[model samples]
Target: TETSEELLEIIHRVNQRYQSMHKPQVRSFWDNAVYHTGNMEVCALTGNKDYLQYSIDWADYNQWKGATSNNKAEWRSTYGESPEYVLFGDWQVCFQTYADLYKLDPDTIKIARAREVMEYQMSTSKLDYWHWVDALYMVMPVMVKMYDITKNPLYLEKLHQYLTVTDSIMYDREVGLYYRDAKYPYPFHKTINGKKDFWSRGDGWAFAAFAKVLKQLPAEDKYREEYITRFQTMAKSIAACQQPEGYWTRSLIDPEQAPGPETSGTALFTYGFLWGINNGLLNADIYSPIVEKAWNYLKTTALQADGKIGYIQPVGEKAIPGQVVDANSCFNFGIGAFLLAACERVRFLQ
Candidate 1:
């Protein structure tokens, strides 16, 4: 039996390599560095003090730092405020990363800055920068964490506000899933091969985000039960779509259209589903087998011998027609997500 400690060790060991490899991209000093905070959490959980310090040092040099110091006007062109912000949506994950860190380490200047950014982006704006459903996972979980720390209902309120709008714009009731963004909302756009192009990892983003939200939801809240139900629906729906070898198609519902194997998406989904079952949200007997199979595939296939987590779709804002994610398909946020699910599963199984 694997302990959470063991899983933490595995995640910490590999994610350090991810951070080192992606460090070049973190030069922008904006939300790009926000997710470095999450990697810090993974580092913290796994007792990787050195890795934790790497994130702290990065944030120290880069974070905007306080409410009074940041200029919200500057980020409007990109941070969920842009009207043209739709395709290959990726930056939104940074919002949640900062938000989570703000809750855990508010005294730090980085947390202070993260709080300021969320206030302006999530609360002050109404355009919904989280244009894609993936944004929900990327930024929304931070709300629950903030609420936990401050006892402020507004954080959760903003979370609900963002999620509800996102659901209305992207969720497919019939499919129990979400379209990546408004441009590809359900009755989804067809792939070149006539199949719906709901990217596997995109769905993984929504699934992983939803589970994180539920884990922090208030029990007395009206949305709690609905959250759990929606989670189970996606869990079962995604389970049925897994390929014989335990992977998901590039386009989730499509099998033949230039078919390809997806790793980040599958691994994220695997972590979410397995974590769900191990935590009692899914039926153990019926759902456990699928979760087990997916995990087996992830450990054996998605992860490389060099310890690099593979098949991550590159940095982008939304899915395009000719997208091809290969072995080099890795991202810090995606790997952090893998560690997150793995860490949670290890704990639940214990």
Candidate 2:
């Protein structure tokens, strides 16, 4: 329990730093949405009312909506920062936090927009709405959490359909990893040193998404087996690629490409590994050491003296070689990933 308290101190320090630097009311479905995703977890783990209130205020300011545009006719999932991409998973990420807060205090208004946006998307014929790796993290857990609340089969159905689409293009059977998106398909595009360019954070998104979904998904559900098998497979692949520094590089498969200590992917994978061990999906003997090393990496290197998480790869669709990732490169979503790992580390430590 003392260890848990100390870990929470470290986490709260970083959370306070973030709250001081950024306005909590800036509710975009992009990075801000991601920051609160972990914030809610911090609230869950520590029973800290301040973190919960921060997330609540943010969702209320955004009125529980993802993207700003409410027009169903103009809502599209294409690549754009404009208001029209309302159905895009980037904009729909806020729904994850909305659903979490709704669980805390059951209110119809809290989930009204989330229900509306997701239902509208499901009503359409587009099964390939989630076209990228980031969308898996952005919206898959939201769908599963919505299903937990509503008991509606459509949420699970749509989640499986969208995952199948992303899997078809991104999942590599031999490597047990995702290719970020179809844009970096094998043989067509290679890393700077000629290796399968499996972006670590992209797979981290998928890995963490599966762990989150499985945590809430019904055990008897048909998709449970699929998620379990994949989570285990990806965990095995990721464990094999861990660097001696206990951090995963920007490019996962090739250590030399974009080689440096990265926090987001390392933190996310640490979360998944610890989650698997706690949930009995992985062996403690094998994964406990790996996750412990990762936690040590965070405490010793990625986490700065003032509690800022650093060495996060900046926002990007694909991993680029020779990119600058250092101790000062702290990012919102990356901190969110770090918090998620810290939350799981609490579990592991206990």
lDDT of each: 0.64, 0.87
Q: What is the Å distance of residue 192 in model 2 from its true position? A: 2.0
RMSD of each: 4.1, 1.6
Candidate 1 TM-score, C-alpha based: 0.82
Residue-wise C-alpha lDDT for candidate 2, range 1-350, written one tens digit per residue = 23988898889998999887877788566788888888988888989887788888888788788777867888889777777788888888888888888888899998898898899889998788878898899999989989988999999988999999999989899999999888887889988888898888888999999999999999889888999999999999999999988999888877787877889999889999999998999999999889978999988899998878999888754545676576688889989999999999998876
When summed lDDT is taken over every stretch of 10 residues in candidate 1, the lowest stretch is: 80-89
- Model 2 misplacement above 4 A: 317-320
As a whole number from 0 to 100, the lDDT of residue 239 in candidate 1 is 85
Clashes of each: 9, 0
| lDDT score for candidate 2 against the true structure | 0.87
* Candidate whose lDDT is highest: 2
TM-score for each predicted model, relative to the true structure? 0.82, 0.97
